[PDB]
Amino acid sequence: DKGRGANKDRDGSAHPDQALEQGSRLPARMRNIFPAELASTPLEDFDPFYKNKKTFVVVTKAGDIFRFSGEKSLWMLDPFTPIRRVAISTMVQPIFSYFIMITILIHCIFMIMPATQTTYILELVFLSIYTIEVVVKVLARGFILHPFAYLRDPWNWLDFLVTLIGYITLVVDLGHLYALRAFRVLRSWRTVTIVPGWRTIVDALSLSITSLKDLVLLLLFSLFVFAVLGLQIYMGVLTQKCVKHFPADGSWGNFTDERWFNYTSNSSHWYIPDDWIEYPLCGNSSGAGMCPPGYTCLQGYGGNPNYGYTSFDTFGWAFLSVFRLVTLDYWEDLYQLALRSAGPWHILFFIIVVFYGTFCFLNFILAVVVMSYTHMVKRADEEKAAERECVPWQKLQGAIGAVVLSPFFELFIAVIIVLNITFMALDHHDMNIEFERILRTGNYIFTSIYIVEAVLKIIALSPKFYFKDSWNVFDFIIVVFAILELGLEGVQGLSVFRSFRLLRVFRLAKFWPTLNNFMSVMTKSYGAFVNVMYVMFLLLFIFAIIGMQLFGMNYIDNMERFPDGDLPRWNFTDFLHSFMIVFRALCGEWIESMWDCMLVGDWSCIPFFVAVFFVGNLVILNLLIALLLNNYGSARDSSVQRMWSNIRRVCFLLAKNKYFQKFVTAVLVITSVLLALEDIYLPQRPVLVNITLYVDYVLTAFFVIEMIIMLFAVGFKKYFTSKWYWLDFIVVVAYLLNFVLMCAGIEALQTLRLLRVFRLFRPLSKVNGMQVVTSTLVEAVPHIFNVILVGIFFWLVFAIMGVQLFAGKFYKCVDENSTVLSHEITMDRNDCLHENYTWENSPMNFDHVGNAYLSLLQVATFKGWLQIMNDAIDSREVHKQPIRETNIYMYLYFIFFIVFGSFFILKLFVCILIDIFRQQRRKAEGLSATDSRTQLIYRRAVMRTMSAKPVKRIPKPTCHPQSLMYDISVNRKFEYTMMILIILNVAVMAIDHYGQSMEFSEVLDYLNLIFIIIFFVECVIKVSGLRHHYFKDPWNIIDFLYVVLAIAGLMLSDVIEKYFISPTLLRILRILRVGRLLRYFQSARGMRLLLLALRKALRTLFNVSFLLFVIMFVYAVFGMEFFMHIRDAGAIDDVYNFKTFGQSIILLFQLATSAGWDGVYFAIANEEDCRAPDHELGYPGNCGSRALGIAYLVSYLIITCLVVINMYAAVILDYVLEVYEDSKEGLTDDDYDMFFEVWQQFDPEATQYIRYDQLSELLEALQPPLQVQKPNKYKILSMNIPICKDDHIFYKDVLEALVKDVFSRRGSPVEAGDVQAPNVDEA
Amino acid sequence: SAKDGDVEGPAGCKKYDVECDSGECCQKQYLWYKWRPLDCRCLKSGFFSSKCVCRDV
């Protein structure tokens, strides 16, 4: 429309074309003062070959719509017929743009190899090529002085800034401005245009960045309000180290004047237990970690964890520690360092910053990327609507072909292939010679069946229709690679023909339809995946060469900063090491790589690792989700009857009462908080043991009597067929069995008492919002079970490949305590045992396929994956010492697993819950299933009309105080000038820092007395002018509660002052008043479409977390039974363990995001060097369980971390996508709330009518999309508002008329007869 | 008498780290400061290829 008129705007004397290239075309036109036969209405081919090429380009240039041709159009802004015409003829050639693309793919190869004496002689020639296409593409057309010239499009604007870089770094600059030569890799972004279909991803990548302008400014505001809030309550907290007492009567000085400051603040008087790097923190609080005997916790005494980079004592460093907590990378080392120093009640800080930080504001980013991809795909499908619119030989062939026709012979090959995969998945390291003999002779049988079958199939069908389909030609390649295996085993040079017997696992794809339908879509949409895979590996190539040029020589120059003076295993010192350190930051991990970057260099590491996290992980990984949502969207028996049906009629009335089933709910919640008090301190609290004993006897009487009431109400048939009453019946059977055992001897089993926790799910599904949340976990439970089974299959190919590469390796010769020996000291098992050492195995290994799956879940969740990589790179042979880094190309096994098994398989769980919640919310809102795409936009505009009323304006009272306070208590000037002072009350709190001075806190305390009294005047004016209406606004009671607690802190200071007006709680209330900004701006329509989408989801995002707390309640009670006496190893210690119910929730909140389940697994599944339970004495024994530890964690990660944490993103993407479908098709919820705001400016009463005169000022004062400008009186006659008597109109009949004006002027034929048909259907 | 790396068993004795076939190992060998028994295990070498060797237990 607008560009369609702009297409004709170029046509008349503005900018005439000069050439044309559409389907092998090379034309030559001019600016109609001396043109040469372009075209007007003929399609000629006679005179010019440029016209003869334009005859085939008469239909092909305008084939799809308009975009096949490209014209060097300048209208001869400088006379276009010199030799300039020849450079036009060269630039339009397809060989020219094919030549520059080749010299870029060559110049990328000379970046990844290290430099030499012939680099400067070869960096000079490629600079000479790229300066010719910038002087040809300007001397053919180009200035900055007119349209289409040369600097209009960004692609020619990428030649010019990079070629100016190449001429700066060659003249004067040798050491200064040397960082600019790193950016000559940016020219390699041109080669996106070589893969077909590049426009639907790059424009979607471009629409995503230009649509996050409204979110980054909202996320920069919420990080600011958290960096201030974390600075006030955690400054100096992270430097608390236990310092030994000053020695009584010892070898130091007498007077504790300055010798107390030389004794303390000497590094040999801090604790540092047993060869550790950092020093352990402690706290004076109650659940915080304490110090040994004879020491003490002290604050100060410099040294801050992670080289000084993990802190909260400056606004700069508090802004970084909050940002890694929104990111969730290695955040449990911050979570565990702030609960150890400040005690366990500070989990309430981390719940808020994880809820509002990474479950909301990182799922709004997912929603913008999903809506930006689906806009550029659905745009690119209108273009698909335009392209589319002898005699013994033939004897046996009936007999051999008789058996290969049936499903019986297809069953027989299907039994063998499931059996052949089993013999590949049973071999391992150190296997018996009889057990290995079976697997060799099974290979001679299974290859023999595959040869008989192929030949039989070829004879039966034909030797020329056999190669028709793709399965019979895939089968024949297997028989080729298998018949080489039986001949190349006596050669025994290389076992690479032994690798392609792993390729026959994919024979199972043609048999069972779940894996068949999964393969079918990856081939139907192969063009979508290869584009995003190429863009992702092209960004990692750009960032690898930038990182290697910037940070490369720092890792070699001053290695001395690193611990033990060695390189890290992850550094920017080579290409293959720069690639993997950028690739593991796209996987999430960037903070640990940034510490040792910034340790060895400058501040410039910080803009690098944020830009590779923001581009790599928040955009590219969310396009990769967004592909999946579009491709994977699919005697006298009547007289005994008055006794039996007499009880039956009464007992059915108990189950229907609202007081009975509220009584039974109240029992089950009281009796399970009793179950959270059975901890390790229970066998010394003698009164609590007897309470929890006689409750287990009343509960058996309560469960049997309730069961008889249900069986006398719902009957036998509907009891035992329902799924909830089977939870009832198992628990009653579980408590009859504990009563049987304890009458007759045996003490009760403590894992059958814990089954009444599973009875808290019946009253949980009756909470007001929880019916939508629990209905999508039940509807999607068969859809996850297909994705798990398809997930097990592709993981199995990587596992029975990882066994064949890594089994028998990962052994090493280790010293007394833990230190791994070196090569040239020992180099095999012979040299290790002879020197009386030990030859240990790694904990996570690849010996058999059971050990493979645990070690491969480590690298799929990215938690424990550095040690398995550090084992896989060092391994060389079965009984040799691992030399470090000697096998560096085993990284390619892990890149191909993380792509095909983390970015793709584990992101299908997000794809399911987005699909199912979108259609279960529609059922729960009462809407019609499969109504329409646009008719529901019109229903939500009528259903929001019917349920809206005006709002009473505040009645001003009449006194000399009351009239002149209310004048200033209502002004929009006064609301702003009391808001700009709240902001300056909090920006002053961001310049507090640790150990500032005494003179600096003399200004900032007196400045905190000026603002504390302006907010007292404001709180008097807004109550003197607003009698009881002040207390109705939630941002006024918080403003009221601050001035009360802050006047009580200054006056009446020393009342008792034990702890009443503690200055932490006043700091929390200064920062909390900035939240009025969320109800402040409305001119930012891009932000209010995210604040309104947020508010409509908070009720159903409180229910997703309240289901998560119940699941965390269930495993915290089972975890205190199983894993309470475990000895201290790795992550379970004296502070974070499973002893009390407090310590269990601290760990299970950490493990809900899978943060560090590798260290929790290493303790709770440890069966070596443990004592035994001597039950005839006591001592339950400090020994973990391998089998119970796997089933506890692996079931937990597939509940919280895969289908409950992924439930927040399914809710955010549903409501955000609805709100944007109301700004582009009509009437958001903030549009109605403005009509009733301008309604009370004309009707300041409880009435609902106005005067018919005032209608011309309604429709002029409000904002669009409801305005009608002047003269409006001919727009109101046709509008037909029903005038009631005495010149009064009703607000409904004006609101309905302003609805039907909007739908008419936007939706032409789809809203006239539809938006009026729906309103008649209700009224 | 623990004189050297020495092994006790029958004739045809195959020592440690020598290829065996289904019971052609020895009873017990003094190899690394102790007397250790020996079975005929099969290790891993390359894809899907086992190489069988007398190993200690």
Ligand SMILES: *[C@@H]1O[C@H](CO)[C@@H](O[C@@H]2O[C@H](CO)[C@@H](O)[C@H](O)[C@H]2NC(C)=O)[C@H](O)[C@H]1NC(C)=O
């Ligand atoms: C933790 O509490 C102890 C005492 O409960 C505090 O120790 C005192 O510290 C001051 C100076 O910091 C010394 O002059 C006192 O002699 C110490 N007294 C004792 C009994 O140790 C310690 O400061 C507190 N640590 C904090 C708040 O971080």
Ligand SMILES: *[C@@H]1O[C@H](CO)[C@@H](O[C@@H]2O[C@H](CO)[C@@H](O)[C@H](O)[C@H]2NC(C)=O)[C@H](O)[C@H]1NC(C)=O
């Ligand atoms: C470790 O090797 C040493 C030799 O380097 C062995 O030395 C023995 O040491 C003990 C004392 O601990 C002496 O009584 C013996 O005479 C030494 N020889 C022998 C053959 O035992 C020692 O045996 C090895 N370590 C162990 C634990 O056996």
Ligand SMILES: NC(=O)OC[C@@H]1N=C(N)N2CCC(O)(O)[C@@]23N=C(N)N[C@@H]13
């Ligand atoms: N080692 C490893 O897996 O590296 C990844 C990353 N780095 C650590 N130092 N971690 C502490 C242990 C851990 O789980 O591995 C991890 N904790 C988180 N949240 N990610 C891990």
Ligand SMILES: *[C@@H]1O[C@H](CO)[C@@H](O)[C@H](O)[C@H]1NC(C)=O
């Ligand atoms: C303590 O004072 C002594 C001088 O008596 C000085 O040598 C030492 O460096 C001081 N301690 C510290 C930690 O500076």
Ligand SMILES: *[C@@H]1O[C@H](CO)[C@@H](O)[C@H](O)[C@H]1NC(C)=O
């Ligand atoms: C304290 O500092 C002094 C510096 O002279 C040093 O000699 C000593 O080892 C340190 N530790 C103690 C316990 O004095």
Ligand SMILES: *[C@@H]1O[C@H](CO)[C@@H](O)[C@H](O)[C@H]1NC(C)=O
């Ligand atoms: C353990 O390693 C430490 C070095 O961290 C070393 O000093 C010690 O000798 C080793 N063995 C021990 C602690 O007995």
